[PDB]
Amino acid sequence: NYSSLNRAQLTFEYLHTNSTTHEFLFGALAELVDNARDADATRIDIYAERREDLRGGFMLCFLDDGAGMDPSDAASVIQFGKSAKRTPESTQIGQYGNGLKSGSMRIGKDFILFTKKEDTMTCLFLSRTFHEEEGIDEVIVPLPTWNARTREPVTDNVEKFAIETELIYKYSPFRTEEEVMTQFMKIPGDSGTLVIIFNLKLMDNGEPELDIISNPRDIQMAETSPEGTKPERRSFRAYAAVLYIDPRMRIFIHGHKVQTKRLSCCLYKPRMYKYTSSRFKTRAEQEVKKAEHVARIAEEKAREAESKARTLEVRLGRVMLRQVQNRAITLRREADVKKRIKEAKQRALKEPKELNFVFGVNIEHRDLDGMFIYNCSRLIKMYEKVGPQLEGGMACGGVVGVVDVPYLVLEPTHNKQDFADAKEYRHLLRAMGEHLAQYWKDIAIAQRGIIKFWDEFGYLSANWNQPPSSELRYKRRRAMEIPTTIQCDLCLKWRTLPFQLSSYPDTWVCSMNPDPEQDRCEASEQKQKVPLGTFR
Amino acid sequence: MAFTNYSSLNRAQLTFEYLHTNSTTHEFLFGALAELVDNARDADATRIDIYAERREDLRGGFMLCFLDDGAGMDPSDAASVIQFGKSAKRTPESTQIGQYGNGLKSGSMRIGKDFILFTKKEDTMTCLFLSRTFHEEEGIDEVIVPLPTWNARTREPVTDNVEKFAIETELIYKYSPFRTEEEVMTQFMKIPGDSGTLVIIFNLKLMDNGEPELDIISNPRDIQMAETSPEGTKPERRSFRAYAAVLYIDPRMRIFIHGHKVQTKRLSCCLYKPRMYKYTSSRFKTRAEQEVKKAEHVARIAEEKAREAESKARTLEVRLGGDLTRDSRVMLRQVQNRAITLRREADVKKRIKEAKQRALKEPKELNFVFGVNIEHRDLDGMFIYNCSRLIKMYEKVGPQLEGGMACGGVVGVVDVPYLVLEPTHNKQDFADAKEYRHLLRAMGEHLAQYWKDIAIAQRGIIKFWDEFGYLSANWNQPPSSELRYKRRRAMEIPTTIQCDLCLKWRTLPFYPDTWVCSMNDRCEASEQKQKVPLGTFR
């Protein structure tokens, strides 16, 4: 029993320390998007609610129709490091038990979250305003729960519940129980979550860092954009569109749909190269050696306990007989379950241990090139130049590369904007650069003449940065090379259209497609067939 | 200042897995080691020894030890180590590097699974033991930390709870590298002064081939990354000896690696024709003004309260003119002493305010220094320090962002105060990207002015580099090693060296172990400052 020993604890200032991980402000917003995706949301709305009395003049709201949280799920939010998603073979993005706290506290001073699941709905209120005004150096968090159907409090301590709600009514944007219930009612289904960040951070001139005015359909960085500034680093609509390699969840900003995309579907002559990863193989082999030791120990424990149970039965020829017998039963089921996981890791070990590099030419935007590196579907690095692109030449200029890296090979840094194992990441970039050179040889556009290739798509200007010509002949020349893809708003499937779109998307559903083969939500989804190239 | 009793409410808590989460901030492994070096400098150490202790029974084969002779920690200071976010350093316009209440924990847990720290101060010695091995083995999901303290002279336990002390020490003997009290005391004996700290990180992380990430074998005087170094690899990204040498803009603390002194340096003193440009910072001035206004308010309130108590002491004394009772005597003394206390406090706040007002009138400028790296022209770009600690190195700006020879070879240095920029969580970037980008743009413009001011076009560029021994066509290749060319570069950059005794920096007119002023020539010849000529921008 360790009850007298010191525990590590979190203090108020740590909320700030943790938030300084996000020098890229959109990567703080991405944490909350990730959480909606991981909760199996089919939709997230990211929108502003104007509030001239709050710092920055609006609250930033994230509303999803995902699985929601029950009261114990909600309470584990403030157990830093706790992540039910951190399970073997987990393909959730969440793993570190931190992102909502680091991201929200980068964006604003305070947040209030509303969540509903089955018959409960819970509010979690993180108010740094409260801690400052009342001199609190711990991190104290109101967490009231109500019954979702009757709106009665669900609490084991009515005095505590009264203090919690009084704090919410005093310090949150919502000053009455009615106003709080109004927020719960914005979650219209049986489950979902609404996260509201408020008292947003200001620049030195008193304006918020997030600009929702310049383009009312977007969330932009409030800073001047130089010449080669990437759209994804100043427009959240642009960043959200490529945040996942395999978008399904629909994203809306200020009520306007984001045209999410699969980068490999947006490129000229996409080709895929399979890269055998020694790291992937070694780590899978070690995860097996470990599972087989874990199953071995459990079996010896179960075998001892069963032996003692049998001997005690014959000796007794009671109460204690069942402590021994059931202990044997439980160790045996423990041993069997670990043997099954050992076997499952052995089976997976035989699968190919390969990373799939995909390359194609960004003919619409030659200057937006380099590698996009995803980690368990989540974008980590964008526009990373490799191989010949690291020279001052036109070789491999315009080429976009995409790869999805599993956690066994790389895990992210604390801010999910870099990779924690720099040595192995640098190795990956060299491997990607070698394959990029092979892609470039393979499509041979440099053997035939690289300037004349770009001329054909209408790059009249001498500066590498300006867009290709917008006259009609060059528009159609470019468009002919890139299929038109679109997601159904009802069934979430990805479709191709046999014509070109005119221009911010509106609602589209399968039955609007003139293609008789994709004409109904019940028609099965066609997969991109990216052709395979060969290294060396 | 709480409205009610909040003891029933939920607190946020730290769990075991967060130690790992926190450590993933350090993708640059040397940045995790730098956290511990920063703590030693902040504790006013005159020396830190970073060394390996071979232990074939522990993961990675050795423990990494950080031994300093700084101010150490008493038991309450040690307990606050594990209050994440708590930092007594976080004070107005601080010149300590620490401010976030995290670096020891993020850095140590990047490097290894476990650490044990020994520290001495005044009459106490304390051990702090962070054992992820213990947590895994016993299934602990909180973060539980043994923190025993002994009397430094008698070695008797200093504790409020002898049962807790026995549990704490037995955890250390079970899970740490030191399995008896005697072995622990041997570690305290390595702190030979009245104060200091020894941090030992062990069960080091391994690469897939089973070897540690840190290579202490290839060069037994260094700590290197166990990785191949391709062509464009900077020394400070592969050699901890190289990194440590430039980690601080104004080195004082001596650094030893495996017992061998690091030749720390001031980058601005290693360059050809250094020039300084002053850049006015509006944020620096605005923020310093707000800090003065806060101190003015604090002083004014304290003066009001002191005058109130002083008035009451005067009027109460007259009201008790004829009164000889013990009651009236004790109550008059109570208010008289309260007036004395508040007057002393008011006079302290006044002095604090007046010091801040005087500091406010100093120029609120950043100092950019530029020079040509004629010894290694490929090692160029900007070195950006923050409260004297290196954050960004080799950052190319201005003309250097083009293809060309313009500003090739130029190194720039700037020390940014905390009022202007603060660092990211891993102290390897800046938290305010917008303002950092503004600073880079300004540095690039001043760089272009520097290149005009030294006017290499006048003598010609090709011939400039040829004269210092760069006859080869390639940019990446080192300059000639002929005697003529070594001396020609040597006349342009005076050799400086630090005295091992007094820590002063001195200049020599023209070794690996030690050097002192009398080898030049006495330690209290006042330290001479290089005057860097002033340029103007536009």
Ligand SMILES: Nc1ncnc2c1ncn2[C@@H]1O[C@H](COP(=O)(O)OP(=O)(O)NP(=O)(O)O)[C@@H](O)[C@H]1O
């Ligand atoms: N939108 C949401 N819907 C449902 N559950 C959520 C949502 N946001 C947060 N959660 C829950 O809150 C927990 C903590 O979230 P967070 O702090 O982001 O850590 P994490 O997602 O588990 N790991 P990471 O994001 O990698 O640090 C999650 O594990 C979920 O259980």
Ligand SMILES: Nc1ncnc2c1ncn2[C@@H]1O[C@H](COP(=O)(O)OP(=O)(O)NP(=O)(O)O)[C@@H](O)[C@H]1O
């Ligand atoms: N070598 C040391 N000598 C003396 N005190 C030390 C030493 N190392 C750590 N400490 C103490 O431990 C505290 C916590 O260290 P740390 O976790 O590094 O946070 P910090 O230094 O205060 N700020 P930061 O490094 O920016 O996160 C410090 O504030 C000191 O009080």
Ligand SMILES: [Mg+2]
């Ligand atoms: Mg998360």
Ligand SMILES: [Mg+2]
């Ligand atoms: Mg520190």
Ligand SMILES: [Zn+2]
């Ligand atoms: Zn459909």
Ligand SMILES: [Zn+2]
């Ligand atoms: Zn000296």
